[PDB]
Amino acid sequence: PTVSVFSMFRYSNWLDKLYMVVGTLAAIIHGAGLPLMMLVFGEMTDIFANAGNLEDLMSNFMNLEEDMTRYAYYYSGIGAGVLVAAYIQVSFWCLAAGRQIHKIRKQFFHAIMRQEIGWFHDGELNTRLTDDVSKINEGIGDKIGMFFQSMATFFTGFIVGFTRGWKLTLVILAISPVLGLSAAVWAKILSSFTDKELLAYAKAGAVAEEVLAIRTVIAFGGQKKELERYNKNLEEAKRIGIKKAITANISIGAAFLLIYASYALAFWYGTTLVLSGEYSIGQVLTVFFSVLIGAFSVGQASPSIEAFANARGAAYEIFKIIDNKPSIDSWRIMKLNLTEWPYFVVGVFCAIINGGLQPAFAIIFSKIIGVFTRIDDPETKRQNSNLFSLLFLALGIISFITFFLQGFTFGKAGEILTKRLRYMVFRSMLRQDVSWFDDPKNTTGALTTRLANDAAQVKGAIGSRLAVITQNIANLGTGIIISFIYGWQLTLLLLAIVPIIAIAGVVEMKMLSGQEGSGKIATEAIENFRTVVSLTQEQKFEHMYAQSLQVPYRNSLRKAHIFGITFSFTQAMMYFSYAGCFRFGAYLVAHKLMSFEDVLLVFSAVVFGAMAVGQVSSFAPDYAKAKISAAHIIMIIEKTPLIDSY
């Protein structure tokens, strides 16, 4: 039961329609920016490789800087265009969604107060008002821009690949389906991770809220019975969580292995074509990166369709309600997990190995490209390219294994800790007294949210923090050390933008993820609707609601522009990094202080190392909130009652 496609934008005026049109135009322009950048990257790589080959030939760089000024200009132009287009897209789609959602909220409350007493259906109506409109917002908001941007990226990358090298383009097309499928599964797992963590506990949460809602339990003395009833559903939730920690991690590890195996295959075939003289290494780079990023994006834009369908489903009931025409017309924390040190040891080892996978990839990639920036025997070049393709495949296998192992070990330790903490907290609460239960800071809702959230958040201050820190160290620290060994001037230059690249990764992950007052008036009106319709305060309550929506409306309209500008700037910084790094690299290669191999190594190990650091740190939970919840859990566990009933 969904509304029509062109019926969900019924509350969009001419300004919202213009916003949506210009937003999808800017989204297409923004999506068509990465394949163009890969084209420019391939041309620049060809320049560097030809200069290096000629220098190695005439042994016994005079135009390199002049040629690289032009490509720095191209990089900067694409970066400024991406800045403008991404800002326009994000801001315009956010504005259109916000205005339509404001109108929908107002109309929905107006119609809710307009219903009849026989109509007034439950709780249910309140949850509808606070959740279905958020569903519509998520569906008609930035996700449409995401879908159009990724469609543009896919089509532009494949067009660039087919116009640059159709043989390699077809070879990577043959694996594009599994790449898009893995990207879609990855995005779905990331989008439905917290909802499944709630679904796993939804069974035990009912037993908790029923027992805590408690004097009967204390009187009849069934504390042990209710404790075992809770512990059974806790076992079930722990089993479901362990199954998820297995499945999600093995799927994402398979995705990583597929990415690296695509690297291996595509580079093996591309080196074959280059050694045969048909392709150049820059052409291979352009084709490979364009087609691969397009195939990944076309699968990355799969949750947008699900969000749109959920928006249609959620808007169906709201539109039916608002179209109803009634008859009448009115150390201390880590010790908690100390028994899981066998899991933590394996987790830390696998996190070290997983973090070290990015510098290893930088080394292998730089070496396989530097094979073609120098002259050598054909057989030697072929053997080196084969060895580096096999090394790419080994990187993929190690990535799969260690990613799955780290994820599973840390998730199992977290599930064990969560079950244990929930059990001890429920036991200590059942051991407490009615004098403790009467304390209005110990409300039933507060206790249930302590059991549901705080116990599940303590693991964020131990396993999650440890894994994130270990991975980010083993990645970026080793990358920076190797970059200082190989090219210290380029490393010193790129260290100035390392924080901005990490912040760009964080902001982009938050952007893909999608991360009071008016609710009070609404719930009071819905609860006391009999008295409201008796005193005929429908219009006055509508007025109070509309005035309580004003500050959130203005905050949303401002946050639209703020997040648009910050996202656009963080995106354009990734484009400007190319220009800066490779201009300085052209200088250093022309002045014989470094080679293009080392330039590529420093680039891949520093810029993309920081990007991966940001992408990983986007998954780290709030450490302060985790420690506060751990303190809460610990005090409730160690609380001893006065009138002991145990």
Partner: antibody, heavy 122, light 114 residues
Framework: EVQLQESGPELVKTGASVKISCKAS????????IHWVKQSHGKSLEWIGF????????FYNQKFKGKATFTVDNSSSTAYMKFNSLTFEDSAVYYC???????????????WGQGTTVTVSS | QVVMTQSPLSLPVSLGDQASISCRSS???????????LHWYLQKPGQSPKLLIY???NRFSGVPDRFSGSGSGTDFTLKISRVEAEDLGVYFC??????????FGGGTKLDIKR
Amino acid sequence: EVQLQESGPELVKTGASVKISCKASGYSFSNYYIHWVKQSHGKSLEWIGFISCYNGATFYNQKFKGKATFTVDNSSSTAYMKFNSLTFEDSAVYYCARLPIQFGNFYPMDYWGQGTTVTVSS
Amino acid sequence: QVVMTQSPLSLPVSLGDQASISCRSSQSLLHSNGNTYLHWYLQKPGQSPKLLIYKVSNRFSGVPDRFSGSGSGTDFTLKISRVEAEDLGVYFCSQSTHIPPWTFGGGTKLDIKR
């Protein structure tokens, strides 16, 4: 089917200039150097120099530096060798060969042109 | 600046017989990477020189098994097992180890022995 088709025989006057061509077909033009070789009658072949078919960077034998100029037209995928102030000792057969940029001097001159006969006489 | 010397300027041969063309370099043609870059080309009148052998012994793609290459250091040899009618021409060697100056052999014309 790699082919390096050269221009026809040309009879020029002493002291003048002339430009011979080598049109490539059947392969990626911008991935090779075009080397020029000179063969006089009863003499072994002699390397004049090469040009990069990717950007146009040249290298000349120290004997021919100044009196020969290499150019490239990537649109038509042709290479040109131009003389300056020709003389009798310039009358010879000039060949064009291709060499992979990836393996310089570590790989033979796999394909050659059929040769251009240049007769210089006043 | 290796000076390549082709031992027989002219070599009279007969149909269905073995022919051997020698090449001597004024300097060792073995490279630091362990390879010797000596190539043998065949040139017919009015046609482009065709690559026969490269790196001493490796046969080019399409060349029949009639042609073989051997030797090392400063002494190399091209051998034709059964001189056919399509083998009469000028065979010249070429070194690629010591450049910029690519140098070639003097050539060896195959006359028909009567």
